[PDB]
């Protein structure tokens, strides 16, 4: 009936003065725009149909055409930034916000979806959706005693749209909007649906990626223990955003990092640092690097949890990016650690993998490793053991690497390698 229409037939039907013909044509457009391959979005836009769909959004007495037009506009706004912009330029934002209060759950769901696409375009349309007043009705849709009474798809769509309202960072979302959304986000973060949990964790990760004041807004809500719990989850779609959020949080002040530590996060890193998923290993090692850049008692907590051998393992064998994160962790550890902590690090076997990594073609990691070596040598000096560390570095073949670095492109590598060779060798 409304399958495989031509855009010309759709235009004829919508340009008729017959609401039912308009509805059939709008459904035909929806079915065209919801097909598997190559939906004719640009042809629909060229025909000037967006303003008609937007007007149909306000037909309270014809809920079917409201739903059909909402779906069509949702699929148009899901495309390029120019197609989303075409939807916005037709006045769709306030119409969808008004539809958020529809008595029909499927229509309000479609409005939530469309606003999610518009906000997901980027920070400008996100902030414009916020300025039109979307947050209040969106959150009102979730103001129920128990989230389990809502349909799973409805709740997942609401969570995804809210996460898009927390997304992007040039500029970051308005502070007032973040504060208005956060409690509902915590609620959702305690839900039992894995997709809701994943998207809520992703929203928290968005909100924690930035200045330490944003991290503080998030941490003050008491979400860190739940984030650690989810970090322990069996589903990787949940562990990934939880780990991102935890890493973001430990990029902040020593007190925020301490909040992460007090919640028991380190006990999970034996698994994360050996996780078969490369991205998990990389981001866990990055998190560890930011924790080793903390205070000496926090480095000591890293030591007590037995995580130094796991850093040695990652440095010894892993994807090169994870090995770079591990080099960063080692340099931070040696820069901020006590003499006893650096001695412990050496006793765990860091020297050999550190040296084997000096044969890489990435200048940054070479600089990081040479700085770590300098710090360890300073500790040795304080202990009067410089010659023994020298012998160790020679035995594993690191002396030859440092000598080769003496003739390197970068000036810092040149200088540091020559300083090491002339002061300790």
């Amino acid at each position: 009936g409304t399958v495989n229409w031509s855009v010309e037939d759709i235009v004829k039907g919508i340009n008729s003065n017959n609401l039912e013909s308009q509805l059939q044509a709008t459904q035909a457009a929806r079915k065209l725009l919801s097909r598997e391959k190559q939906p004719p979005i640009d042809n629909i836009i060229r025909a000037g149909l967006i303003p008609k769909f937007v007007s149909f959004l306000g037909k309270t007495d014809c809920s079917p055409i409201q739903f059909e037009s909402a779906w069509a506009l949702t699929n148009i706004a899901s495309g390029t930034s120019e197609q989303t912009k075409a939807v916005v330029d037709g006045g769709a934002i306030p119409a969808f916000i008004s539809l958020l209060a529809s008595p029909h759950a499927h229509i309000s769901e479609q409005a939530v979806w469309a606003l999610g696409n518009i906000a997901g375009d980027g920070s400008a349309f996100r902030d414009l959706v916020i300025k039109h007043g979307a947050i209040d009705p969106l959150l009102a849709l979730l103001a129920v005693p128990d989230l389990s009474t809502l349909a799973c798809g409805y709740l997942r769509n609401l969570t995804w749209t809210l996460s898009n309202l927390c997304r992007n960072k040039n500029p970051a979302p308005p502070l007032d909007a973040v504060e208005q959304i956060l409690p509902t986000l915590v609620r959702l973060l305690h839900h039992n649906d894995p997709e809701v949990l994943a998207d809520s964790c992703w929203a928290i990760s968005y909100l924690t990626d930035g200045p330490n004041e944003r991290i503080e807004m998030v941490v003050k809500k008491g979400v860190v223990p739940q984030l650690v719990k989810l970090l322990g989850a069996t589903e990787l779609p949940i562990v990934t955003p939880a780990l991102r959020a935890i890493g973001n949080i430990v990029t902040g002040t020593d007190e925020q990092t301490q909040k992460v530590i007090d919640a028991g996060a380190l006990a999970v890193f034996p698994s994360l640092l050996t996780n078969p998923k490369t991205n998990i290993q990389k981001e866990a090692t990055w998190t560890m690097s930011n924790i080793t850049a903390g205070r000496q008692d926090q480095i000591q907590q890293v030591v007590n949890h037995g995580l130094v051998p796991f850093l040695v393992g990652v440095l010894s064998k892993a994807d090169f990016k994870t090995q770079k994160e591990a080099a960063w962790a080692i340099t931070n550890y040696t820069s901020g650690g006590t003499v006893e902590q650096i001695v412990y690090l050496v006793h765990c076997g860091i020297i050999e993998p550190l040296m084997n990594l000096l044969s890489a073609k990435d200048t940054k990691i070479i600089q990081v490793i040479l700085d770590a070596i300098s710090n360890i040598f300073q500790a040795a000096e304080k202990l009067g053991e410089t010659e023994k560390l020298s012998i160790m570095i020679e035995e594993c073949g690191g002396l030859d690497k440092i000598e080769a670095l003496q003739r390197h492109e970068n000036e810092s590598v040149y200088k540091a390698s020559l300083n090491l060779i002339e002061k300790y060798f």
Binding site: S34, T74, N75, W202, P237, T251, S335
Partner: peptide, 18 residues
């Protein structure tokens, strides 16, 4: 010395309803 950042993939920014 703290270094800020820069299915298991992040949620899609936009979603078509098939």
């Amino acid at each position: 010395r703290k270094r800020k950042f820069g299915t298991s993939t992040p949620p899609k920014p936009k979603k078509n309803r098939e």
